[PDB]
């Protein structure tokens, strides 16, 4: 089959996602959105952060981890069976490509 | 500007119950978890709750588990520490805090109030 | 469970510079923050995520973090910076906010 993610409606979501700053005392922006990562960002974007911090929010989803040490997992909070679908989570790593995509599988029951 | 105003400390005697308040404004209340920290006289910084943006997590230190409980009304932009069976040593200044934006548990202690002195004595 | 240790008290001539340690088991991994407290006064942010610095804080605060060993750097120190100061770090293991013991700055001369 292949890697999913599980709740119940009302519950909070908890969705993984995570860096090694393989290049310490220095951070890199990260992005969520809905939808698959297509080629460049990520969809329907929901929460981002700079090289610093958050500067894009949405009601209910928050970063859970210590991003700045590369935990960059996601709670989503109170949700519904609209949740349901794949998430983009994304890794700004400076190169030619480079960036880190991640998939992320959330089904509501 | 952001503005952290507590109130509701006094004196209040041993096994003895209070409840502090904390009023917020210059930003969107819901969208930050919020804190208490305390300090007894000539002591460090000892933090205390914590709750997130929404009330739906709260974090208590040990020191308090059982006794105080953190919430929040997100419609009147205040924050509550409900103290019960007080004793001696949780004498202090009790500060309000706020964390910072999109983060579930806050990290860290943006904006501070200037604080409310509880005592706890016969 | 997881602990902080600050060396209670450190001295410093004018126009030097003040290094306060903060000691934690591979601290390197956790994100640090760091806070002043003149006397009579609430606590002020004035480093976080290692060494990010708040809007309106003097250029002369800096901070680092690795290994074992976190540390405010305070240049150019005036009498004015004379104050306790804390580190802080957020366990989520045990879900409790920890301080440090303090510093206190003295300015000497």
């Known amino acids: 089959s292949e890697v999913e993610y599980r709740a119940e409606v009302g519950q909070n979501a908890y969705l993984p996602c995570f860096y090694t700053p393989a290049a310490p005392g220095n951070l890199v922006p990260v992005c969520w959105g809905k939808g698959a990562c297509p080629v460049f960002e990520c969809g329907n974007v929901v929460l981002r952060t700079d090289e610093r911090d958050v500067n894009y929010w949405t009601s209910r989803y928050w970063l859970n981890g210590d991003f700045r040490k590369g935990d960059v997992s996601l709670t989503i909070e109170n949700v519904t069976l609209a949740d349901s679908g794949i998430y983009c989570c994304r890794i700004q790593i400076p190169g030619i490509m480079n960036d880190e995509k991640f998939n992320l599988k959330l089904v509501i029951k | 500007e952001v503005q952290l105003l507590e109130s509701g400390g006094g004196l209040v005697q041993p096994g003895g119950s209070l409840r502090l308040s904390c009023a917020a404004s210059?930003?969107?209340?819901?969208?930050?978890?919020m804190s208490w920290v305390r300090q007894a006289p000539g002591k460090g910084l000892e933090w205390v709750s914590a709750?997130?943006?929404?009330?739906?997590?709260?974090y208590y230190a040990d020191s308090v588990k059982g006794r105080f409980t953190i919430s929040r009304d997100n419609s009147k932009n205040t924050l509550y520490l409900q103290m019960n069976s007080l004793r001696a040593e949780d004498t202090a200044v009790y500060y309000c805090?706020?964390?910072?934006?999109?983060?579930?548990?806050?990290?860290?202690?943006?904006?501070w109030g200037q604080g409310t002195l509880v005592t706890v004595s016969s | 469970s997881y602990v902080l240790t600050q060396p209670p008290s450190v001295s410093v001539a004018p126009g030097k510079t003040a290094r306060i340690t903060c000691g934690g088991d591979?601290?390197?991994?956790?994100?640090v923050h760091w806070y002043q407290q003149k006397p009579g006064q609430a606590p002020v942010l004035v480093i976080y995520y290692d060494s990010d610095r708040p809007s309106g804080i003097p250029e002369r605060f800096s901070g680092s973090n690795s290994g074992n060993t976190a540390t405010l750097t305070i240049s150019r120190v005036e009498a004015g910076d004379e104050a306790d100061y804390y580190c802080q770090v957020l366990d989520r293991r045990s879900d409790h906010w920890l301080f440090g013991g303090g510093t206190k700055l003295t300015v000497l001369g």
């Open positions: 709750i997130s943006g929404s009330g739906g997590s709260t």
């Open positions: 591979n601290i390197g991994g956790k994100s």
């Open positions: 210059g930003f969107t209340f819901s969208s930050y978890a």
């Open positions: 805090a706020r964390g910072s934006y999109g983060t579930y548990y806050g990290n860290y202690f943006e904006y």
